[PDB]
Amino acid sequence: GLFGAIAGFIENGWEGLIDGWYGFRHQNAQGEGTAADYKSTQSAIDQITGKLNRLIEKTNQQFELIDNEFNEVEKQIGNVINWTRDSITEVWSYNAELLVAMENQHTIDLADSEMDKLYERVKRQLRENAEEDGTGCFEIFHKCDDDCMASIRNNTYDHSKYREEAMQ
Amino acid sequence: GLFGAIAGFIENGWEGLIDGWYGFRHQNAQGEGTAADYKSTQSAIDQITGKLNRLIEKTNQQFELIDNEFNEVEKQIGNVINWTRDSITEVWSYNAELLVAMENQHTIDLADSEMDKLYERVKRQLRENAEEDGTGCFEIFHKCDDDCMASIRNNTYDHSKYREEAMQ
Amino acid sequence: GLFGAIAGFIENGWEGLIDGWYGFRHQNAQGEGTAADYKSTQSAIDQITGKLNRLIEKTNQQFELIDNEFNEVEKQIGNVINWTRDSITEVWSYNAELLVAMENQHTIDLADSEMDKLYERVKRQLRENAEEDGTGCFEIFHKCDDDCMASIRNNTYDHSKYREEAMQ
Amino acid sequence: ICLGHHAVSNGTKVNTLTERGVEVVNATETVERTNIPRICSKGKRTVDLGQCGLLGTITGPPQCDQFLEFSADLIIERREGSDVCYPGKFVNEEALRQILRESGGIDKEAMGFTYSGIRTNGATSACRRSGSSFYAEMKWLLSNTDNAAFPQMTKSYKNTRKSPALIVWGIHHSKSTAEQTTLYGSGNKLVTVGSSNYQQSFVPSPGARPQVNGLSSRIDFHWLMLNPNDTVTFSFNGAFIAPDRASFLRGKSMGIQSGVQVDANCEGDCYHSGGTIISNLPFQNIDSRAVGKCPRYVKQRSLLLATGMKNVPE
Amino acid sequence: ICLGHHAVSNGTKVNTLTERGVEVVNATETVERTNIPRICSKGKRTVDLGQCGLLGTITGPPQCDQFLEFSADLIIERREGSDVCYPGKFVNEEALRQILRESGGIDKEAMGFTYSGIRTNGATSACRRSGSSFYAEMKWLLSNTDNAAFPQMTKSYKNTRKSPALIVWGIHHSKSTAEQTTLYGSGNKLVTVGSSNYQQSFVPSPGARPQVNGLSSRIDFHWLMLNPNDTVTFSFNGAFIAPDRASFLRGKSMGIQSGVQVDANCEGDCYHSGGTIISNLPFQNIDSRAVGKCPRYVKQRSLLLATGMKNVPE
Amino acid sequence: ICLGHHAVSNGTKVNTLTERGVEVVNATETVERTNIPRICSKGKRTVDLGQCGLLGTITGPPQCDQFLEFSADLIIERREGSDVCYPGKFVNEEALRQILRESGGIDKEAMGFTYSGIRTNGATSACRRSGSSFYAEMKWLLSNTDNAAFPQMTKSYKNTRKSPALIVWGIHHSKSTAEQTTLYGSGNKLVTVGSSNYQQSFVPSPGARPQVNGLSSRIDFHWLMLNPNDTVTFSFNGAFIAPDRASFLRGKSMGIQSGVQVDANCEGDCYHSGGTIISNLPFQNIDSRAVGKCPRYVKQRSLLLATGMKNVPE
Numbered sequence A, B, C: 001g002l003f004g005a006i007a008g009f010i011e012n013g014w015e016g017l018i019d020g021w022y023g024f025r026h027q028n029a030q031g032e033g034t035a036a037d038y039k040s041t042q043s044a045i046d047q048i049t050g051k052l053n054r055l056i057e058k059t060n061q062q063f064e065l066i067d068n069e070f071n072e073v074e075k076q077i078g079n080v081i082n083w084t085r086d087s088i089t090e091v092w093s094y095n096a097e098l099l100v101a102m103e104n105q106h107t108i109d110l111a112d113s114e115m116d117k118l119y120e121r122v123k124r125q126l127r128e129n130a131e132e133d134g135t136g137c138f139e140i141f142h143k144c145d146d147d148c149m150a151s152i153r154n155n156t157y158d159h160s161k162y163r164e165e166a167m168q
Numbered sequence D, E, F: 001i002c003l004g005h006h007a008v009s010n011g012t013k014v015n016t017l018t019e020r021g022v023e024v025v026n027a028t029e030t031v032e033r034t035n036i037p038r039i040c041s042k043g044k045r046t047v048d049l050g051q052c053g054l055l056g057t058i059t060g061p062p063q064c065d066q067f068l069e070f071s072a073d074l075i076i077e078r079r080e081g082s083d084v085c086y087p088g089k090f091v092n093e094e095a096l097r098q099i100l101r102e103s104g105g106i107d108k109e110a111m112g113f114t115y116s117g118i119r120t121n122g123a124t125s126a127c128r129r130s131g132s133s134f135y136a137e138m139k140w141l142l143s144n145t146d147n148a149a150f151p152q153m154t155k156s157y158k159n160t161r162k163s164p165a166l167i168v169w170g171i172h173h174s175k176s177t178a179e180q181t182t183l184y185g186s187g188n189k190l191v192t193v194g195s196s197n198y199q200q201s202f203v204p205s206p207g208a209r210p211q212v213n214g215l216s217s218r219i220d221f222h223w224l225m226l227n228p229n230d231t232v233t234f235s236f237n238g239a240f241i242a243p244d245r246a247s248f249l250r251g252k253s254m255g256i257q258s259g260v261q262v263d264a265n266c267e268g269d270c271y272h273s274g275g276t277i278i279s280n281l282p283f284q285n286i287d288s289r290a291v292g293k294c295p296r297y298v299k300q301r302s303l304l305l306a307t308g309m310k311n312v313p314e
């Protein structure tokens, strides 16, 4: 993707992450725990769902028969009719192929984007109280228990309260 | 958008910003003032204008009448003609819908991009003389009057001149 | 482009860079040397090549003659045939124009993206052992010879080994 | 603390602008391939013509007696349908079929032709209704006795209604010139038909044709649409199958050609000869000649649209 | 110091690939709906045929006397136009209309047919020019006196010019066989027309048709295009409306069918029956049968293209 | 240390969604303009009809004697081709050409008509094979002696094969009625043709036509396709050019119209009159009527696709 997170500096996805599209994996002193982020997940699904709502719509144009399967119509007019239909088919096969190719590129890139947005959001929450690994992890120099980690996930982390210790 | 500035970590736009698309809102000791950035604004408008120049062009293909509004042409050839025209209409209605949908996505995303480009440019100008809030604002630890702020906007800010104080 | 590297905060390309699409230009104490980065270059070419493989494909639909260059067919059926063909031509000329325009935008933007991915990767390798100029260059405060620079390019740079000196 | 994304053990491959066979966490099909082998007609007044050919509903061979004034939203033609009993054929037959397929059905009305000095009960063992009969909506006009001269005659009809009248007549080609003189008297025979927007003349051509239903003769059925307040005039001296009633179109409908059963328990709007395409997908790879409100036919059997992020397993 | 973007109190909703009704700061319409109820003809030699039917300019009924050699870039047909005076009809009429709509006008030239032994001044009260007259470009050939035999005759014309000649002739169907014998003598009548690329035979069919303009007879107008240096030959023995002049196409033009006035003060290139579409937009929702250089017709009434960033009010 | 990208001294300008003439490091053409002025036929059984017109292969004028049972994958019509020797023309000629272009060639078989009481060796100096001859696949049936009556006759043929039979017959229009009576006896002449799905009658029309190949007479060639197990019956009393053999289609092929030489050393699948389009590009600007497996024709002469990053020189 264009944003070099997913399949980029983040080495892999989590097959154990069954409760969201994106999430946090923390370790501190109590061990490790993993939880999903709802807002990022819901943003990507809402955008993908919008794409789906567009393509499964009704085209309320009725087309009627212009040739005959039981009693073939005159040859010349039949050749014009077959030629026209084959030309339209050429057009719709191309449009379908291009549409899906383009939309798949955009879907992958949008999911990549949502990860980077989550990553950058957290880094500034932690501000100077941490420096990032380079693999999607934040080396936290102050170190806090599970409620504080819980505070990073739901954006209740106050960088100042830990400010002096972390630089130190 | 894909770049998570506009409608992202920047909470809202400025309804008082009547002189540009993007801008700076500063406060120091003299109060607050707001000015627009010309280069970022002009980049987005130039790109949007280019899109406009493409879609309002001349198609110099002439089509002539092939049926008759006053004296209906023969039924079978008329049904082929109506069927073909309705098929082409199906194609152009889809193309128009898809074109506008795609271009609107790209227009929104490009405007989002121009904001992030402005934001990242300024952060490195200020270098280590500041740390960012997380809302699109730069907490400046050295603090300078209106001419210095003017120096950030027109990129005449020398980070070194204030270097020692800001870290301190 | 959307990522504000190429033709953005990076002022120009290197006409002397004949061995890759992206690269590093270093100076330390031994002078200057320039080398290309293979991974970023190969990523962009692989993506551009994929685009090429898609557009130069076979359409195995055969169309046969439906009018006559030597003995003109009847006028009315000939006018329907010319009208239909001109309509399809209108459609394919638009599709070709739009396809190339869209793909060129995406190609330029993807190349812009690969640069930013390279830039951001290196900055976190150097971590706090450096601060960035603002022009695509990293001011390295520790300073190392050509083998160490070689270590940045092939990602064998250990930030810790130089950690104390660089902050100092 | 580390940021990450989900992944799966076995993903789905899709195509993009730059790459073929990229694995994503989830995808969905856009091209419909599953067909329902029935004509899903729930909610729609349906007429299955069966052995009645669609054009026969206007002239009325025996197999169409039940369809002389049908009313429908959906019309189904069958391969075993026949427009005729006495061998013969319509001129510009497909144009008339397309008109009747969208007619919503037909309403018949007597045109009021009366005769004197001729026989009017021409019949055949090919149009059997408990013996020799004829097309129920037509009259086979012949001379009173064998070889008597068929008098030159003129019959006119004014469409006093508010929608166009479908007028059908026939030209009889006897197997020989000798047979034509017996039925209508000797000499060349001519029928001219004119309205405000129509004019055409017809002369019968007796001769041997291969035997169909025992007969080497044929009947040509011709038709025109008569506008409100316009008049049609027939001038003839023999070999003329006269119309007894005119047809009026009821409304709107759609016609299909199928070889599968009717199902009043499924509902559909896109039909082909093999059944019904019921789908929310924008494209189909089932039948390029499907009609109704249909997904666009495409040549591809499958086009997978990504619905999840790239799949990067461990 | 804070970075920001502009916003507005009331934005405009648009659609994207992922969302419907996203508010952006500004947008612009891509589908044209505003029509100008006139034929904008500024700068274009325009011919408004009015009561002259386009095909009448070749044969010359009275209402077309002013249009026998018109020259134009834009041709306007009107609903009140008539191609005929004596009731009758052209065979393959729409094909000839499409030829004449793009002809740029016509240039007439005498074909040089001379006669002896017949009358040449056939006239009717249906083609009135201060009394009974006929088509100005044709001659109604009849026998010298009532019921005299019309002699078998042959008339040939060579196109000595460098572009194809439009040749038109007519077949007269008298109201009765008795009337046909008076005008041309008794018996079957036949007209054969042949060129290097054309051959067709015609026999008149007398008979009653409903009365149009007082007549139950009709005239059939037939036509062909004669190539340079090619010759057309007419062989006939009666019931033949002979051409007096050939037509030559002037250049290029376009033809429309309208019910609105001409405006030499607006300029346009896309016309429909209701007027002119003047627009820089790539699409239109006004008339799918508009002709000229037109925006592409689409079924949507509106497609808003975003021209500003997303609108995020406070 | 500095990050950077490559650039070139002279780039290539392309277009994007937002800008025209952006310079990129490299680009490639998508629209094909280079034509090969030969019919690239390597690997394909090719038949160059030359002076034989495609329809002539069914009837057999002298210039087509070498093509009476041709077999081909690719059929090339030439501008100098003629379908006829005796002047005349096919009815619905283009439909038959489209059938034969995709036929893969024809296989002839005797239909088995025998005659008694007439002459069967009608000949002309227009179909010269070391003197007067005729169409090799037809027989010109005439009376035994001058002005003798041509007997009413019936000839039938059953298609006993498994694919449809192409049946062709002719109607002879002599230059005068006097000439028609000499060849076939006096009076009106009629030929009726009927099958299970076909019925049409024909009467000859003698008359002067301009002289082509010395003759003012013409022959009309008519055709039908006879289904397996179906029968065709001809009923005629003169002026009838009878078929001697039926044609059967061999398989599949494609037909083109060209004015350039055959090249068995280049291979192609997209042909137009000027040669062959050999290209991997998705679009072409060479000929909108090219046929085969072709790049899509577009109106643009060039569409440059970027294959490198933006070019930012120093």
Ligand SMILES: CO[C@]1(C(=O)O)C[C@H](O)[C@@H](NC(C)=O)[C@H]([C@H](O)[C@H](O)CO)O1
Residues within 6 Å of the ligand: D121, D122, D123, D124, D125, D126, D132, D140, D142, D173, D174, D175, D179, D183, D215, D217
């Ligand atoms: C040949 O037998 C019949 C038939 O049943 O078709 C007998 C019919 O009564 C007769 N009807 C009339 C009105 O003449 C019919 C007729 O002779 C032929 O069909 C004429 O081609 O023949």
Ligand SMILES: CO[C@]1(C(=O)O)C[C@H](O)[C@@H](NC(C)=O)[C@H]([C@H](O)[C@H](O)CO)O1
Residues within 6 Å of the ligand: E121, E122, E123, E124, E125, E126, E132, E140, E142, E173, E174, E175, E179, E183, E215, E217
């Ligand atoms: C019936 O009256 C007229 C007419 O004015 O149409 C009288 C015309 O002089 C006469 N002209 C000729 C050339 O015969 C015309 C004619 O008899 C009919 O139109 C023939 O159908 O009739």
Ligand SMILES: CO[C@]1(C(=O)O)C[C@H](O)[C@@H](NC(C)=O)[C@H]([C@H](O)[C@H](O)CO)O1
Residues within 6 Å of the ligand: F121, F122, F123, F124, F125, F126, F132, F140, F142, F173, F174, F175, F179, F183, F215, F217
């Ligand atoms: C006019 O000369 C010929 C010819 O060569 O065409 C002589 C032919 O033998 C003769 N053939 C027959 C079968 O009659 C032919 C014929 O008279 C005309 O072509 C009839 O239009 O004429």
Ligand SMILES: *[C@@H]1O[C@H](CO)[C@@H](O)[C@H](O)[C@H]1NC(C)=O
Residues within 6 Å of the ligand: A072, A073, A074, A075, A076, A077, A078, A079, A082
């Ligand atoms: C039109 O298409 C069908 C196949 O879809 C084909 O069988 C038929 O022959 C075609 N019509 C003509 C006149 O060839």
Ligand SMILES: *[C@@H]1O[C@H](CO)[C@@H](O)[C@H](O)[C@H]1NC(C)=O
Residues within 6 Å of the ligand: B072, B073, B074, B075, B076, B077, B078, B079, B082
């Ligand atoms: C073609 O379309 C118009 C409506 O746009 C319709 O009224 C007309 O009947 C159609 N032609 C035929 C032959 O049905």
Ligand SMILES: *[C@@H]1O[C@H](CO)[C@@H](O)[C@H](O)[C@H]1NC(C)=O
Residues within 6 Å of the ligand: C072, C073, C074, C075, C076, C077, C078, C079, C082
């Ligand atoms: C169809 O197109 C060609 C030009 O491509 C033109 O010369 C020809 O006249 C057209 N057919 C008719 C019947 O006008």
Ligand SMILES: *[C@@H]1O[C@H](CO)[C@@H](O)[C@H](O)[C@H]1NC(C)=O
Residues within 6 Å of the ligand: A052, D026, D027, D028, D307
């Ligand atoms: C995958 O996508 C399809 C269509 O969007 C959906 O019906 C299905 O439930 C999805 N599966 C999972 C596991 O999300």
Ligand SMILES: *[C@@H]1O[C@H](CO)[C@@H](O)[C@H](O)[C@H]1NC(C)=O
Residues within 6 Å of the ligand: D228, D229
């Ligand atoms: C037909 O004529 C009657 C008068 O008898 C009139 O009421 C009606 O409006 C007319 N209809 C049309 C379609 O002209």
Ligand SMILES: *[C@@H]1O[C@H](CO)[C@@H](O)[C@H](O)[C@H]1NC(C)=O
Residues within 6 Å of the ligand: B052, E026, E027, E028, E307
């Ligand atoms: C909004 O866009 C349209 C079209 O681009 C333009 O004419 C109009 O002036 C714009 N309005 C503002 C306030 O920018």
Ligand SMILES: *[C@@H]1O[C@H](CO)[C@@H](O)[C@H](O)[C@H]1NC(C)=O
Residues within 6 Å of the ligand: E228, E229
């Ligand atoms: C027609 O013939 C004349 C000779 O009389 C010649 O000059 C002219 O070029 C010919 N035109 C064509 C189109 O063959």
Ligand SMILES: *[C@@H]1O[C@H](CO)[C@@H](O)[C@H](O)[C@H]1NC(C)=O
Residues within 6 Å of the ligand: C052, F026, F027, F028, F307
């Ligand atoms: C530029 O692109 C074309 C097509 O991709 C390629 O054939 C050519 O070798 C390229 N040139 C360079 C210098 O890369």
Ligand SMILES: *[C@@H]1O[C@H](CO)[C@@H](O)[C@H](O)[C@H]1NC(C)=O
Residues within 6 Å of the ligand: F228, F229
């Ligand atoms: C034709 O009839 C023969 C019997 O003589 C039979 O074997 C064959 O299957 C039939 N063919 C068709 C197409 O009906």
